[PDB]
Symmetry: C2
Subunit: 207 residues, 2 copies
């Protein structure tokens, strides 16, 4: 379970620019790619969001852990995640795609949920077509509730990706996710990020 | 006389990512460098704050004009500027320094104002030591109005820099401030940003 019940409690106790930073680029009316668990909290979300944003021109938001270790204490689950700038950003966008990391060093997989079923299905379908393991979330991580930060975009229907630790390790050269090496990404990384852009494209193409 | 009375009015008329964007990086609990008039509104404030932020580790906020032409319509005067993320940012930083541009194509000068009299005086001194024209504003740009966005930091005391067009042109090679050229900066540019870091550094050494 979390250390902080929400982000106020977190902010009250932690020092900004030492344990955590926040990054925002609002540059799109329609779509925002973001993570509440970026930097060291869930490793690889920052870099994947950067690439997806660089590919799409989507807006960006990242609440980032900066500690060399033990960023898990900076984890506030998405249903409780209330950083005010995040909430302001979400409300200013029709759509939202969130990026998460879950522990499974033994299987490469992505579990996609959220209330935006159409974009949810599309991302699933693009990842697969790049040979990247992906399925609709079921026991866990389904995110069909109205609290999950991702469904608090304007449409009230977001898409959550929960990416296994094995998979995120395979984004980086040498399967090594050390900070020093997070600039060195693999072909799978690139394909993953392109899959997201394609799915966003068709979505806005169907609509 | 501003096209819009406040940021809500602008936002209800403009498209983000076409007319305007907002960039935020919260990474210091004491100091934020920012501009309500960045990108093409007051040209050169974006580039200066990038450099000052890189030198200092201070937090960043930019409200950027993006249009090729007529960025003037996106200028919302400091005392009216209430973009809520900027308002949020300022509230959580002890101190703040804002970068503005004013039109004077023939003189290099910076007019320094704000309720933070100590940091203001340091900035003028450090600017002057680099052979850069700067003085305490007295007849305009005094920035003592508690409504001016820069004074809405948690101390309620900010520092404002009003920098002449001639000065900002001089930040760029061939004195050319056309957007294509804005990554090509001068030595005077480097000096100017270096002065601000020395001011800040000298400042906190007090407390
Ligand atoms: Zn997460
Ligand atoms: Zn201005």
């Amino acid at each position: 379970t979390d250390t902080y019940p929400n982000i106020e409690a977190l902010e009250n106790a932690e020092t900004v620019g030492v344990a955590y930073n926040i990054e925002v680029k609002r540059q799109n009316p329609s779509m925002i790619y973001f993570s509440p668990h970026a930097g060291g909290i869930e490793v690889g979300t920052t870099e994947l969001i950067y690439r997806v944003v660089e590919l799409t021109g989507g807006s960006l938001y990242l609440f980032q852990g900066l500690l060399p270790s033990g960023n898990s204490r900076l984890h506030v689950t998405s249903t409780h995640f209330d950083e005010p700038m995040a909430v302001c950003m979400l409300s200013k966008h029709t759509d939202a795609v969130s990026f998460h990391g879950y522990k499974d060093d033994y299987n490469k997989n992505t579990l996609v949920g959220g209330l935006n079923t159409e974009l949810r299905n599309l991302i699933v379908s693009k990842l697969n077509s790049k040979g990247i393991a992906a399925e609709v979330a079921t026991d866990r991580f389904t995110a069909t509730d109205p609290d999950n930060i991702v469904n608090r975009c304007a449409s009230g229907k977001g898409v959550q990706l929960e990416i296994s630790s094995a998979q995120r390790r395979a984004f980086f050269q040498n399967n090594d996710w050390s900070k020093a090496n997070r600039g060195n990404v693999t072909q799978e990384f690139l394909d993953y990020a392109e899959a997201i852009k394609e799915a966003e494209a068709e979505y806005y193409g169907l609509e």
